[PDB]
Design a protein around this ligand. Structure first.
Ligand SMILES: *[C@@H]1O[C@H](CO)[C@@H](O)[C@H](O)[C@H]1NC(C)=O
Ligand SMILES: *[C@@H]1O[C@H](CO)[C@@H](O)[C@H](O)[C@H]1NC(C)=O
Ligand SMILES: *[C@@H]1O[C@H](CO)[C@@H](O)[C@H](O)[C@H]1NC(C)=O
Ligand SMILES: *[C@@H]1O[C@H](CO)[C@@H](O)[C@H](O)[C@H]1NC(C)=O
Lengths: 320, 148, 145, 319, 145, 319
C-alpha cells in the first residue's frame, strides 16, 4: 500500500516552440530571443545627433544649393540621413563626377570645418557676381551655389586664370569645382568671350584637363545648359593649381576633414525624433536586450544580430 | 509516465509519495538546481555563438553600374539568408536538446530510486514503486536525500 | 534482438505471440501510425528549410573588368558551396535521426510491454517475455491494447 | 505463452550515409536529388524564348543583315546567345557600355521597334551609299538596318541638326554611332569636312564625339571602325543630334513594352519544341525533387541547385 | 559506474573479474576494434566535408574604387566567418557524438553480459554482477566469448 | 565470484568542448588546427618566387633604373611586392588600368623580354636625350629601360608612323606612354609642334591621346607627368603607332611564355632559402593539419583557413 512515484512539472501555459523532429510543441516555459519592435523615429546615437538633410541631397549640401542654407556650417554628426529622392539637389542641371565614391568617403567622416580658400573679391579681371540662374532661386531671385563661383567675362574679356591654393592646414581638404557646358557658340562667347576654352587642374596626384561640350539639350529646371562638378582631397602641404580661359566654376569654400570614424549615409523618409539610442535603423531605433532582431538589415550602433526570421523562440521548460 | 502533474509548483522534477500517514508532492532540489543552471548556460552560448555574423552596409551605385549594384544586392541578401538559416537551425537544435535533456532527467531519477531499493521494492511500470517493507515519512526522505 | 524478421510486412513495428490456441504476427498500428507521420513531417520540413537559399545569376564582364568578373565568380561559387554543405550536412543529420528514431521505438515498445506486466512475466533477454499466468488471445490483445 | 518484439526486413540493396557511418544498407531510401534533364531549350510556362542562333545581341539590335530573322521579334521568356556568335558587328568596332545594355535586356521581355528617323528624311546627305562589303546581304555590300551611314552629297556635308521627341508612353532605346576612318583622304572622300564632331543631348545625356583617324589592322577586310552608343530616351524627353561628319544616324529605335524576369542564357543548343517550368542552359527540368545538380544558372520554378553528385534520405530501417 | 579504471591499458573497454583462483583486468578486443575504426572514420570525414570551403584571393583596387574594394573585403570576410562557424560547430557536434558513443558502448557491454546470464546472476547496481553458480577462469572467458 | 564492466582512464589533463558542455577533460584529444608558421618566404614546390624587394610591378615592367635586377627574370611561382615599394614610377605619373594588369600578372608564371623597336631605329628623332634626374642611374639622369622618351631633332619632330607585327607564337604585353608637359614653352622645346597627339591601333585597340599641359606640384622634382598604357598584342596582330609629339615609344615588350596559378603577395619579408608546399605572406606552412589560422591569403597545397584560435577533437573517453 505504501508507494513512491517519479514525475515532472506541468502548468496551464500555451506557449509553443519548434524542433527538427517536431513542430507546434507546447511547453511550460519559453524564452523569446527575437526583437520585433522599434520606436519608429530617428534618434541621437549615444548622445550624438545625426545630420538630417531633410529635402537636400549630399550634393546640394556640399555645393551649397541656396535651398540648403541650413547646412552651411553643420556641427559634428553621428550618421547622415538623406531622403530617397531629395528635392534640392543640383539646382542648375548637371552631374557630380564620382558622386558615389564621394558619398563613400563621407560615410567615413564625422565632421567638416568649412573654410574659404578663394575669396569672391579676389577676381579682379572677371565678373564674380553675375553668375546666377533662375534654376537656383533664393528668396524669389536668381542665385547660385554658395561654395563655388560662376565666373563670366568682364569688359568683353576673359583673361587666362592662373590660381593656386596651397593647403597649409593639417587636415585633408575636400575641394570642389565645376565646368559649364553651354548650349551654343553664341552663348559661349556671350559669357566667356573666347570660343575655344579649357580648364586645367593639377595636384601631386591629380592631372585634369576639361573642355566644355556644347550641345543642344532638353531643358531641366528651365536650363538647357549643364554644369559638371568635380572633387578631390588635397592632402596637407600639397597645392592645387587651376588654369582656365572660360567655363570655369571656381572654388570659393572647401571642407577641412576634422574627424573620421564610423558613420553611414542612411536613406529614410523619417524626421528627427528628439530621442537617444544605442542602435538605429532607417525605419526606427532599437532598445533591446535580445540577441536577434528582424527590423531592418542596415543598422548603426551596438545592435542585436539581424535575421530575416518572423519568429524565434527557445525552449526553457519541459513539454506538456 | 502517463503525464506530468500540475500539483507540484516547487521545482521541475520531483516525487509523489503514498503513505500510511498521508500523501503529498516533493520536488528534487538537487535535480532542479543542476537543470536551471544547464538551460541558462545554453541560452547565453547561443547569443555568443552568432555574434560574429554578417553586417550589411548601404552602398550606392549609379545607373551605369547596374551589374555591380546587382552583385552587391545578391551578396548581402546571400549572407543574410545564410545566417538566418544558421539562426533558425540552431534554435531547433537547442530546443530538441532541451526536451531530450528533460526526458533524460526523468529516467535518471527513476533509475536512481530503483537502484537505491533493489530487492526491497517492486517497479510497477507507470513510473512508480511499491515498497515491500512499509516506509514512513522519514524513509521517504531517506530515499529522496540519497541516504536509504 | 538478434536480428530483424522478413516475415512481417504489415507495419514497421509489431509483436509475435506464441499461445496454446496458435501463433501469428501482429503489427502495432499505434506505433506505426505515429512513425509514418513523423518521417513524412521531416521530409517536408527539409524542403521548406532550404527554400530561401542562394540563386545564381549570369553576369557579363568585358576584358578590362577581369577583377570584378573574378569577384563575381568567387562569390557565386562561394554561396553554392556553402548551401551544398548545408544540404549535404542536413541529409546526414536527418538520416542519422531516422535510424536512431527507429531503434528508439523498438526499445520503447519492449519497455512498454515489460512495464505492463512486472511481476506477472519473465524477461528472457533476446527480446521476448514468458508469462507466469497463462495468456490467451484476448490477453495478448490486452497487452497490445 | 509468450510475446516478442521485432522489426521488418527485406531484400533491398539501397544504401545511405550518416555522420557516424558510410555505406549503410536499409530497407527503403528516398532519393531527393534530380540528375536528369531533357537536353534542349524549351518554352518557359508557354512562352517561347528568343533564340539568337548565330547572331549576338549587338547584331540583333543594330540590325546586322545576317540577322534579318530578328527584325521584329515577339515577346520572349528568356534570351539565348551562343558563346561566340558569328554575326556580331559586321563592320568592325565596338558597342559602348555593352555589358550594361545586356543587363537592361535581362530585365526586358518585349520590344516594339519603331522608325523615328525615316531614311528618306535626309535631303542634303546621301543615305543610300553607306554600305560595306564587311556587311554582305544576298551577295552585295549592305549595312546595319536600324542605323544609317550618311555620307556627303554633291561634295558637301552640311551640319545636321535633328531632334526626335519621344511622344510615346514607353521608354525608348535609341542607338547611334560614329565612324572612325583610316586617313585624312578617306575622311574628306566620305564627309568632305576634315575636322568633324557629333553632339548628342537629352535631359540626362551630354555627349560630344570626335573621330579617331588611325592606321588599324583589317578586321573583316576593314581598317575603319564604327563605335556605337545607346541611351534610354524617357517619355516626353527629346534627343538632339548635331554633326558635320562621321555620323551613324538612328533610323529605328526600340520601345520597351514589357519588363520582368528574364536572362541572357549562354548555350549552344537549339529550340526543342517543348514547354517547361524550369530551364537551364544545358537542358530543361521537369522534377518533383527538392534538389538538382544539373547547372547553377537557371530560370523558372526550379529545384534547389547543389554541387552534390549523390543525395539520398533514409525512410526505412537498416538491415 | 563510480568511475573508469587506470589499471587496464590494453584497450578502451573491458572487464574486471573476481574469482576463487585470482583476479585481473581483461579488455574486450571485439568492442575496442569496432570503436577504433569508428573514431578514425569520423576524423577523416570531417577533413573531407570541409575540403570545398571558400578560398580567399588578393585583389587590388585604386583610390576611386573604394566601394568595390569594400564590397570585396566584406565578401571574403563574410565567407571566412561562415566557414569558421561551420568548422567550430562541426567540432562540437563530432566531440559530443564521440563521448555519447563511448557511454553507449559501456551500457551495451553491461547489457550484453546481463542478457547472457539472466537467472544465473544478480545485478548489484554499481556495474557488477554476482554469479549464483560459481564461475572459474574458463567460464569468465565464456562470458567474454 | 563476480564480474564487472568498466572503461579506460589515465592522468591526462587535455580538455575539449561540446555544444552541451565546456572545459571537459578526456583521456586523449586530437588537435586539428595549425598555429605555427616558419616566418619566411620560400620556394613553392621547388620553384623560387619573384621577390621584387624595393621595386613595384610598374617599376619592374617599365624598367625603372633602380630595378635593373629584374631586367630578365626566370620563371617564378609567385610574386612578392612590398606594401609601399620605393622604386615605382621614378618619373611621376600613372599606369593606366594598373590593377587589371596586376590581375593578368597573377595568371602568369614567366615572361621572355624581347626588343621590338630598337633604339637605333629612330633616324629623325633624338632617342638618347630623353632622360631625367627623377630617374637616376649610377649618379646620372637616366630613364625607363623598356620605353624610349623621344624628343625633337634639329628643331623638328616629324610625324612618326611605326608598326610592329607580333610574328611570335606568344601573346605579347606591349607598353607605351605619353608625356604631359608643364607649359607651352616646354612643349615646343622638347617636341617643336605645339598641338600634338598619339594614335595607337590594333585589331581591338583604338586609342587617341592628347597631352594635358598644366601646372602641377613637383614630385621627385618634376612637375611634368608621364602616363603609361598597355595592351596584349595577340599572335599575328600588329600595333600601329602614329605621333607628332609627347610619345614614349616601346623598346622592349614581354612574351607571355607560361601561364598558371600565381599570385601577387604583399609582404615585407625577404627570401628565406627554404622550400614549402604552402606559403602565406607572413610565413610558410608545413603541416598535416586540416585547418590553420595563420593568414587567409595563401598559395599551394594548404590546410583550410579559419579565424578560430583553438580547435580540438575528442578521441576517446571522458574522465
Ligand atoms: C560508399 O559506397 C560507394 C558505392 O556506391 C563506394 O564507392 C564508396 O567507396 C563507399 N564509401 C566508403 C568510405 O567506403
Ligand atoms: C516633347 O513634346 C511635348 C509635346 O509637344 C512637349 O510637351 C515637351 O516639352 C517636348 N519636350 C522636349 C524636350 O522638347
Ligand atoms: C606648400 O607649402 C609648403 C610650405 O611652405 C611647401 O613646402 C610646399 O612645397 C608647397 N606645396 C607645393 C606643391 O609647392
Ligand atoms: C602580320 O604578319 C603576318 C605574317 O607576315 C601576316 O600574314 C599578317 O596579316 C600580319 N598582321 C597584320 C595585322 O597585318
Amino acid at each position: 500500500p505504501d508507494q513512491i512515484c517519479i514525475g515532472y512539472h506541468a502548468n496551464n501555459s500555451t506557449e509553443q516552440v519548434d524542433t527538427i523532429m517536431e513542430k507546434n510543441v507546447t511547453v511550460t516555459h519559453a524564452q523569446d530571443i527575437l526583437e520585433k519592435t522599434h520606436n519608429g523615429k530617428l534618434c541621437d546615437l549615444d548622445g550624438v545627433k545625426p545630420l538630417i538633410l531633410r529635402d537636400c541631397s549630399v550634393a546640394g549640401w556640399l555645393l551649397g544649393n541656396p535651398m540648403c542654407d541650413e547646412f552651411l556650417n553643420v556641427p559634428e554628426w553621428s550618421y547622415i540621413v538623406e531622403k530617397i529622392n531629395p528635392a534640392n539637389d543640383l539646382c542648375y542641371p548637371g552631374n557630380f563626377n564620382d558622386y558615389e565614391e564621394l558619398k563613400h568617403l563621407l560615410s567615413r567622416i564625422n565632421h567638416f570645418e568649412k573654410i574659404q580658400i578663394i575669396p569672391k573679391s579676389s577676381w579682379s579681371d572677371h565678373e564674380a557676381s553675375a553668375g546666377v540662374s533662375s534654376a537656383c532661386p533664393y528668396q524669389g531671385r536668381s542665385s547660385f551655389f554658395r561654395n563655388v563661383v560662376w565666373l563670366i567675362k568682364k569688359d568683353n574679356a576673359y583673361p587666362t586664370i592662373k590660381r593656386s591654393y596651397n593647403n597649409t592646414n593639417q587636415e585633408d581638404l575636400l575641394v570642389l569645382w565645376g565646368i559649364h557646358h553651354p548650349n551654343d557658340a553664341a552663348e559661349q562667347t556671350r559669357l566667356y568671350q573666347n570660343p575655344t576654352t579649357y580648364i586645367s587642374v593639377g595636384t601631386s596626384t591629380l592631372n585634369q584637363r576639361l573642355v566644355p561640350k556644347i550641345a543642344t539639350r532638353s531643358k531641366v529646371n528651365g536650363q538647357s545648359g549643364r554644369m559638371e562638378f568635380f572633387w578631390t582631397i588635397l592632402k596637407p602641404n600639397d597645392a592645387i593649381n587651376f588654369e582656365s580661359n572660360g567655363n570655369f566654376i571656381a572654388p570659393e569654400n572647401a571642407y577641412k576633414i576634422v574627424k573620421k570614424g564610423d558613420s553611414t549615409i542612411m536613406k529614410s523618409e523619417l524626421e528627427y525624433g528628439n530621442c537617444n539610442t544605442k542602435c538605429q535603423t532607417p525605419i526606427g531605433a532599437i532598445n533591446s536586450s535580445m540577441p536577434f532582431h528582424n527590423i531592418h538589415p542596415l543598422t548603426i550602433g551596438e545592435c542585436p544580430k539581424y535575421v530575416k526570421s518572423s519568429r524565434l523562440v527557445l525552449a526553457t521548460g519541459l513539454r506538456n | 509516465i502517463e503525464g506530468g502533474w500540475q500539483g507540484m509548483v516547487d521545482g521541475w522534477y520531483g516525487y509523489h509519495h503514498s503513505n500510511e500517514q498521508g500523501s503529498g508532492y516533493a520536488a528534487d532540489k538537487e535535480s532542479t538546481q543542476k537543470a536551471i543552471d544547464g538551460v541558462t548556460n545554453k541560452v547565453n552560448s547561443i547569443i555568443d555563438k552568432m555574434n560574429t555574423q554578417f553586417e550589411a552596409v548601404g552602398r550606392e551605385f549609379n545607373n551605369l553600374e547596374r551589374r555591380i549594384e546587382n552583385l552587391n544586392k545578391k551578396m548581402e541578401d546571400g549572407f543574410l539568408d545564410v545566417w538566418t538559416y544558421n539562426a533558425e537551425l540552431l534554435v531547433l537544435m537547442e530546443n530538441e536538446r532541451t526536451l531530450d535533456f528533460h526526458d533524460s532527467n526523468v529516467k535518471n531519477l527513476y533509475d536512481k530510486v530503483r537502484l537505491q531499493l533493489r530487492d526491497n521494492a517492486k517497479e510497477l511500470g507507470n513510473g512508480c514503486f511499491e515498497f515491500y517493507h512499509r516506509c514512513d515519512n522519514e524513509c521517504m526522505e531517506s530515499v529522496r536525500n540519497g541516504t536509504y
